[PDB]
């Protein structure tokens, strides 16, 4: 492979356990999630990875994961760049609720698509939503490449890929093609959407892809930046199968 890039997702937290979607709520990593980031950094140091640039989202759990890895690598000097286009999927009005609360207010049949389909967008988050203010009042969203009102109020995995692509093509890809070793600290859907694009996965298969957290996901790309072969999880097989088992269902 002419190029190699590493990617991973932070460890999910308390909400994920209760089957709730943190989404764009800027929750901090818990003890377990901070341990994953460290162990991941140790794993990369053990593989002598030397990064030249780092890309993260605007959500602090993404960033803190990157910081802990850089500290473990002793590469805190590596430029770090953040963007909302790398943010987790915006679940709209479904933010906060568990599976049962969703079926109750929207319809079981209706809820199925929203979590298991590739292009069905959940209903938009509204002024009346408990977390509406906390997201849009945040001044980090007042300095994006698009005005606050032009940002997502809900998203499908397809939507995510569509606002992520611009960032890959305009900011990240040029750096890979320039010989740089990149690290991408992302989220569940963020990383999922980028893998679909680089690996050419169908709309039907993208849904079933396994994405363990706290695990380095190595991608070997050719001259067109298209993945050569399957992405590989780096680290000991035990730690991997436990992580995989954790993102099941």
């Amino acid at each position: 492979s002419k190029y190699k890039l590493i990617m991973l997702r932070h460890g999910e937290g308390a909400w994920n356990k209760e089957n709730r979607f943190c989404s764009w709520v800027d929750q901090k990593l818990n003890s377990e999630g901070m341990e994953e980031a460290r162990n991941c950094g140790k794993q990369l140091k053990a593989l002598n990875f030397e990064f030249d640039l780092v890309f993260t989202s605007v959500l602090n759990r993404s960033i803190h994961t990157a910081w802990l890895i850089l500290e473990e690598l002793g590469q805190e000097w590596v430029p770090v760049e953040s963007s909302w286009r790398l943010n987790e999927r915006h679940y709209g009005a479904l933010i906060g609720l568990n599976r049962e609360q969703m079926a109750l207010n929207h319809g079981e049949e209706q809820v199925r698509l929203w979590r298991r389909s590739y292009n069905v967008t959940p209903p938009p988050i509204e002024e009346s939503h408990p977390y509406y203010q906390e997201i849009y009042n945040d001044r980090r969203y007042k300095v994006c490449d698009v005005p606050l009102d032009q940002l997502p109020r809900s998203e499908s995995l397809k939507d995510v890929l569509e606002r992520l692509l611009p960032y890959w093509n305009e900011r990240i890809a040029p750096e890979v093609l320039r010989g740089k070793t990149i690290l991408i600290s992302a989220h569940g859907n963020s990383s999922r959407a980028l893998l679909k694009h680089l690996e050419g996965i169908s709309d039907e298969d993208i849904i079933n892809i396994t994405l363990p957290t706290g695990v380095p996901i190595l991608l070997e790309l050719d001259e067109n930046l298209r993945a050569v072969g399957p992405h590989q999880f780096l680290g000991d097989q035990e730690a991997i199968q436990a992580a995989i088992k954790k993102v099941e269902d």
Copy 2:
């Protein structure tokens, strides 16, 4: 005034109490050095500071200081930018040695200059210094705005100001004039050189300015980015003397 800018320095280490100059050696902050960064962040949060951009050096103690402040401010998303031109003063061959040792190899009168003068450059570091490789083998310096061999091998307070100016003028100044609230996590001489320039301090008076660590240094600039008065230390007026008196001993 019309513009504002916050500067500060990291807590000194063990070497500094042994009266040794860490200089460009990339030492990590100690327990003491990290608590200062946090308390400083808490002090800024307490003052409702909202930064739009952050500048640090390439030495990790500078960076970690910034990260701890951003975390305390809940502004981990603020872009961070690092440069060697913000690095601590390069003390040349004097890196490592203590007072007793410097004299033993150079002379009480000759060393008194290199430490208390504004323009006398210490001898350069030789390829035989214990810390030479540790500094020039590092890849963080193989990606600077000037080739590795062209980096200072020692410096005077004047030298520091001369390689810092290009970065103020070209990178930071434009952002201040653009309405942005900047934060600069620097070092002893770095912060000293910058204040001298912006406040128009003499070569003799500069030597005596008291630069407490872990303290927010507010600077109000006019339209020409010149100091509109003297810089001011912010925070609990109680803890501020604990900072100055400690720096004065």
